[PDB]
Symmetry: D2
Subunit: 267 residues, 4 copies
């Protein structure tokens, strides 16, 4: 059936990848979506092809900005008379190395802006429309680096998708005394459609590497798989779980075979 | 629609309370259930009234025992040709005080038996039938004391519904390299139907106390609310989340107003 | 004895409160300190009275800045020929309410600058001098809101002293493959000397409120008590623990008597 | 100097390995110890050679038993007039495989007995002597599997050194409203003196494998390294930290290079 039918939802990043299969799921399950990206020529060739705009519309938004998050929210109330759900994806990763010493100073500012102090506004403009109605789940989207680490992932993405659990445990302790839920989803390597910028990346040869590395040989992750975790937390069937940081790693995050797959046994 | 339709499920405690609304949900969503309790005269006046046994049957089981968990599992394969899901509830709480010093020695043995080294067998007899088919989520059921504490809850229930996350993170790291998921749900004060044994308890005057104490004024918990968290993790829409300890507290676990509601402000 | 004798340490906030009793402890335990604050007229009437500058010197630093963190580090190497320890305190809290809706937009920028993307530089200029020597613990200082929450503490302080565990778990996974440790201490209500700015605060009537609220009636917190946690992690006796977020709450963080001290018993 | 001088301590496992270098440290730092093991002919050729018995004595104890934990505690009060510290090590690991399916049924009973419902009594007989004096830290000793997992470590050791954080967070919430601290230390591969029982183990060729696997190349773990973590938490300098599960992994627990050391870069 169309499961969370009635809901009006806003994805703050539904052009790219997780965001449009999460969109297409929510419009399959009977919501009305407002995709909301800066990537203008993909975010409406996603909203032009998913459905017909009464249910799916686009809005240039730049979360690095307050007048922009103001208008997305104010025109959802005006497109559709309310805002039940605010899936707040948005996320950026470093364009400087890793290494503390030779990895810089200003792709910390900019990748804190898009990820932490830009995930906030989304929650302040949703908060100021959900609080008047005493209903709503604000889902976000972090990564398994909300929990932990990697010698890959930058000290900034480790740091900003950590605090997107900050104001999602704390945002929780007040938007909760209103019967408004605050959760975030928190994935692992997901979205292809055959990459590259430095080679390695030419994706599928990323997805193949997400199976020799996982802790759940049998399947592969996808976006339908995060969309899963997000309609759950969104509206229906989420109704008393404002806890969560629904870690979708297929278990991975809770091992380290550095010493088991060195320990081994016989040879 | 009937959502996890096809599934064969086993509740290891579906007479009592969480367990039969979780049962009635799974049989509403098109599974075939086998309720499985020692409480013989409630567990079949639950299986006699929910549905008709092709979909809902009872089996005396005593998880404190191995020949008993052997036969429940072996007759599910025989009632219905497989075991996709094993919701493993089961849980007991102290019948001695709290206080380390004057709270005893043998309602640690017995309430470790029913809760930790009796949650195990459920997972060893489900494991030995799910591994042959390379499919299945083993959901359990812990409490928010899997995470934390209370000056109420006994050092034994704090201790045994802690380890039901032991062999649910660890059970995970192997029943996972099989595309078998291992999660547990983890609730807060839930089930009435107007209690007592020492007075206080005369339940609803438990549920009323679960609203002046929560961090989500607006609703009240129930069993449909844990059943929610359990069909999610069971089969469909759980397909790459073997992480979780789906904490369903309405946020509660992540505060302490000892110092805020002492701090206050003006008077 | 003078325990971590030899060490050269840098406090990045040792004028104020935790920072100078942690300083006075490190100079009692035989280190040589460089206090390092913007508060010019307190940071040297702390360095002028603790000891004589061969062991205790001041340096205006403004962690909201890179040329400033550059020079503190470069003149420690020049005052004293190395940098074993970098205690990185620094911390600021909101000067806007709490409430998402009416609590603003730019004391998120500024109190992310001093706390997260200003805790970083401290670790990049210490990192670039500890890595050449393959020795050193970078201790930071977070709060129990690194772990959790409060209806008091702002969504920004909840968010920035969360990520000071970001780049302290992640900073760890690389400054660690160098035998350089990365930990942070993480306290609860500490430092008086009889406050006010809005009344309530007139401190001791803060400390008195840190005893009717704690989970360890018997003592009171202090700065010697965090200094404790910090010489431990600093240099000696820290030598294989790069794990920690040494939570010094006297247990507090792991309860919630909303439902126990509502549950009570007899009246 | 002799740091925690005055203290009377009890190790509940100080014959073997961690336990006697932790003993020798506490008697170096001026305590008076009572080692306390079943291994009769090692536990006194440890107490006969460390020091002279006024400071170091042995007592056959079998924590799988209550009359035994009763007498150790009652004769410490009688050897020495009190019990400030109770380091409660004790720990056993499986003598059946790993695999849920073919790994048995009764080395769960026995290795729950020595580890969880035998760590308890230690804390009930220490509790009943520390509570009369309103002073004392009960340190335990868990493993990094208190936090997480491994495809090595058995589902039972994962499960029992998990709950030794149960009744160490919960034991905390009451032995704490007495100014009695409750913490546990929580190590990684430690103690040689050149092993074997199945070959692999012939230890040092265990310790060598604890360096190609760690996240802190530079040093190696030892027992002085856990003794470190335990005098800290014991008595002095522990005075307001009843939080902790002092994870001493050299960072390890918070990564997984399954996907980084598959991701790599160029070849
Ligand atoms: N492999 C994965 O897909 C993966 C792994 C782990 C976590 N995540 C998280 O998932 C989110 C990323 O989505 P995705 O589908 O993976 O990647 P994506 O394709 O980058 O999708 C996100 C969208 O964000 C857009 N965007 C960037 N800045 C702005 C801005 N300021 N305002 C509005 N839109 C903007 C960007 O153009 C894109 O359309 C982030 O929160 C990640 O932390 C993804
Ligand atoms: N307020 C709540 O409902 C609450 C709160 C927090 C956690 N939980 C968890 O939920 C579970 C309890 O279920 P419930 O509905 O609350 O209570 P319940 O009514 O006790 O239901 C559980 C069933 O377990 C049965 N049972 C006990 N021992 C055995 C045994 N050895 N073999 C087979 N059946 C047995 C018991 O008779 C009952 O039918 C436990 O795992 C708790 O830890 C419940
Ligand atoms: N009650 C407590 O003391 C408490 C509670 C919980 C956590 N903490 C943490 O402890 C730290 C605060 O120290 P404190 O002694 O409590 O307070 P404090 O008296 O504010 O000491 C910190 C110092 O930071 C200084 N400072 C501010 N900005 C800068 C800057 N940009 N550059 C250099 N110096 C600057 C400030 O002037 C002061 O001297 C923070 O990291 C808090 O998160 C304290
Ligand atoms: N590699 C390591 O050393 C390692 C790693 C991780 C955790 N730990 C923990 O450290 C503790 C083990 O100590 P250890 O030095 O490694 O090993 P160990 O040499 O086995 O020392 C522990 C002592 O426990 C003794 N013992 C066993 N049962 C009893 C009993 N019932 N009553 C009294 N004494 C008994 C045993 O004979 C031995 O003397 C456990 O709590 C482990 O969980 C150790």
């Amino acid at each position: 059936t169309n499961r969370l039918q009635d809901k009006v939802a806003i994805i703050t990043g539904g052009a790219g990848g997780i965001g449009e299969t999460t969109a297409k799921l929510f419009v399959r399950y009977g919501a009305k979506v407002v995709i909301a990206d800066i990537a203008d020529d993909h975010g409406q060739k996603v909203c032009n092809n998913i459905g017909s705009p009464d249910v799916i519309s686009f809005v240039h938004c730049d979360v690095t900005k307050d007048e922009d998050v103001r208008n997305l929210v104010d025109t959802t109330i005006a497109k559709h008379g309310k805002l039940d759900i605010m899936f707040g994806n948005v996320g950026v990763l470093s364009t400087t190395p890793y290494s503390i010493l030779e990895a810089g100073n200003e792709d910390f500012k900019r990748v804190m802006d898009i990820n932490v102090y830009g995930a906030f506004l989304v929650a302040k403009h949703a908060a100021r429309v959900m609080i008047p109605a005493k209903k709503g789940s604000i889902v976000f989207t972090a990564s398994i680096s909300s929990f932990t680490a990697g010698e890959g992932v930058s000290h900034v993405y480790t740091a900003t998708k950590h605090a997107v659990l900050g104001l999602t445990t704390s945002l929780c302790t007040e938007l909760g005394e209103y019967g408004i839920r605050v959760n975030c989803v928190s994935p692992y390597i997901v979205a292809s459609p055959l990459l590259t910028d430095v080679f390695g990346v030419d994706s599928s040869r990323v997805e193949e590497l997400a199976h020799q590395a996982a802790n759940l040989k049998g399947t592969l992750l996808r976006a339908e798989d995060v969309a899963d975790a997000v309609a759950y937390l969104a509206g229906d069937e989420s109704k008393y779980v404002s806890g969560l940081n629904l870690v979708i790693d297929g278990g991975y995050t809770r091992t380290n075979p550095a010493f088991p797959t060195a320990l081994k046994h016989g040879l």
